Structure formats: C-alpha cells, structure tokens
TrEMBL record:
Gene3D superfamilies: 3.40.50.2300
Organism: Allorhizobium ampelinum (strain ATCC BAA-846 / DSM 112012 / S4) (Agrobacterium vitis (strain S4))
The organism's place on the tree of life at top rank: Bacteria
Localization: Cell envelope
InterPro entries: Peripla_BP_I, SBP_2_dom
Protein name: ABC transporter substrate binding protein (Ribose)
Gene designation: rbsB
The keyword Metal-binding is assigned to this record: yes
Length: 290
C-alpha cells in the first residue's frame, strides 16, 4: 500500500517541510503508507528518473512527484500512467506533452510569484540601474515561470539592466561563490534576486561576507530559519514564501482521493506570501514559514 513521494533532493529544509505535510496527511488514515525519497542533488536528473521507474516497476499504489526536469521525467510518468498508477505533480511543472499522464498539479503560480518579487525589487530600487538574477537549475519546472515572470516584469516595467542569470544548481555553496563574484564584478549593483531556498541563502551569506548587507536590495524565495533571519537583520528586503507544507499535505490527500476513484481539482494553486519586516510575524506569514 505504498504511496511513493519523490522529490528533487532530500537534503533540503524546503523538501523536509513538504515531507512534514505529507506525513500529516498520511497519518490520518490506515490503508496506505508513504515513502519519501530524492536524489542527492536537484541537478541529478537521471537519478530521479531511475527512482520513478523503480517505483513503477515495484507497483506502488501512487506517486507524488516533484520532477527535477519538465521533459526528462515525462517517459517515466507515462510508464506510471500505462501501469494505472495515479500520479500527482507538485512544485515544478511537467511539459505539456505529459498532460494526459497525471491527474493533478499543486504548485505556486510561479509566473505570478516572480512578478511579485520583481515589483518588490522595483519599489525599493527604482527603475534605473543594474540588478543580478541568481537562479538554480535552468529550465527546471518552477524555475521557468518564476525567473521568466521576474525577468519579463523587470523588462516591461523598468529600464533595469539584468546581470546573469547565474545557475547555482540549487547548491548553497555555489550560490555563495556566484554571488561573491557578481558583487565583485559589479560595484554599482543596485539589487539582487535569489530564486530559491539554497540560492537565496548562499546569496545572503555572500552579501554579508562582502560587507554589503543593506547596501543593495536583495530579494529571495522561501522561508526557512536562515531566510527568516536575513529578513529580520535587513540583509534581505523580502522573501517570497510558498505553500510547501500544503503541497505535501494536499498532495497526499489528492492521491488518497484518486485511490478512492473520486474527482479532484486538476490545478491547485498552493499560494504565496511576500514576507518582509512589515509582516513576518503575522499569521499569514507564520502559516508558511518553517
Ligand atoms: C529547493 C526548492 O526551492 C523551491 O523554491 C523550489 O520551488 C523547488 O523547485 C526547489 O528548487
Ligand atoms: Ca523596459
Ligand atoms: Ca569566485
Ligand atoms: Cl543527470
Ligand atoms: Cl508554475
Ligand atoms: Cl520540472
């Protein structure tokens, strides 16, 4: 009675909060259990494909998948569908090609979330000057909309010059180095966007280490303890926080509905909160912080 939860990496406070939500949902019923697995890094795409294939081959009851690539994971998800195994996608989209093969998609509206981050950037930076974009895995499902939404909004609503994008591969240490390097290369940098949890943490640490905290406008994504501290201490002006717990909890609950041959909502927006010093202790923020 296995429900296989497969995420981009287990080495992550973000994915551990998704696990928390999944654990909560599963613990309210007896018939199914979950496994929680992911490769060693978000860039390990082939390893994730192997995990999904293996789940199909051992005939799990259902799969909750945060695909590390929107295209590379399609063949394995098609195999799940051919095996009559319900699949729900969380966090990061699959290609349009795959639409027939899974039954729900729960995620941030990433284009909208990138736009909120860009608007926050402009309101603090203005509309002239240079900003840097620190991204994670190029073309990963959540990344396309998030960074594209950000970038397109900056272009349409300012004459800010974008430096980058740079790609951290979701490695904190890589983001730290890339940020250190962008700062050293661009003395006139007015702002900097870190598009996911590890990238934003490395970014914040780089800014602090460079002696530049508060001397340019930094905006992040996600809401773990490090990022909360960076908002509170003024290193980051804002961080855009997702419904990570909800993706796990409602992800599992959606699969449980499908396993009972019930109707589900195919596209579920798990919401966002832009967290700043002005709202960090409000209930709406506390509900998504972790
Ligand atoms: C580490 C984690 O960061 C979240 O921001 C992304 O939504 C998710 O796809 C993953 O990259
Ligand atoms: Ca313009
Ligand atoms: Ca360097
Ligand atoms: Cl790979
Ligand atoms: Cl999206
Ligand atoms: Cl993806």
């Amino acid at each position: 009675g296995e429900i296989a939860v497969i995420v981009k990496t287990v080495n992550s406070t973000f994915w551990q909060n998704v696990q928390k939500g999944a654990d909560a949902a599963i613990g309210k019923q007896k018939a199914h259990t979950i496994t929680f697995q992911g490769p060693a890094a978000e860039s390990a795409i082939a390893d994730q494909v192997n995990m999904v294939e293996n789940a199909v081959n051992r005939k799990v009851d259902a799969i909750l998948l945060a695909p590390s690539d929107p295209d590379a994971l399609v063949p394995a998800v098609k195999k799940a569908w051919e095996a009559r195994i319900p699949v729900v996608i969380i966090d990061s989209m699959l290609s349009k090609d795959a639409e027939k093969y899974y039954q729900a998609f729960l995620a941030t509206d990433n284009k909208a979330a990138g736009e909120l981050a860009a608007k926050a950037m402009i309101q603090k930076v203005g509309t002239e000057g240079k900003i840097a974009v620190m991204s994670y895995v190029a073309g990963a499902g959540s990344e396309i909309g998030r960074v594209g939404g950000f970038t397109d909004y900056i272009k349409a609503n300012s004459k800010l010059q974008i430096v980058g994008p740079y790609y951290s591969q979701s490695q904190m240490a890589t983001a730290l180095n890339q940020t250190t390097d962008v700062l050293a290369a661009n003395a006139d940098l007015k702002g900097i966007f870190g598009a996911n949890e590890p990238t934003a943490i490395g970014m914040g640490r780089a800014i602090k280490q460079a002696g530049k905290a508060g001397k340019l406008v930094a905006i992040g994504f996600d809401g773990n303890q490090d990022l909360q501290e960076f908002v509170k201490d003024g290193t980051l002006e804002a961080t855009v926080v997702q419904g990570s717990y909800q993706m796990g909890e409602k992800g599992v609950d959606t699969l449980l509905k499908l396993l009972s041959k019930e109707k589900v909502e195919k596209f579920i927006d798990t919401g966002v909160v832009v967290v700043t010093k002005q709202n960090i202790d409000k209930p709406e923020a506390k509900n998504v912080l972790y």
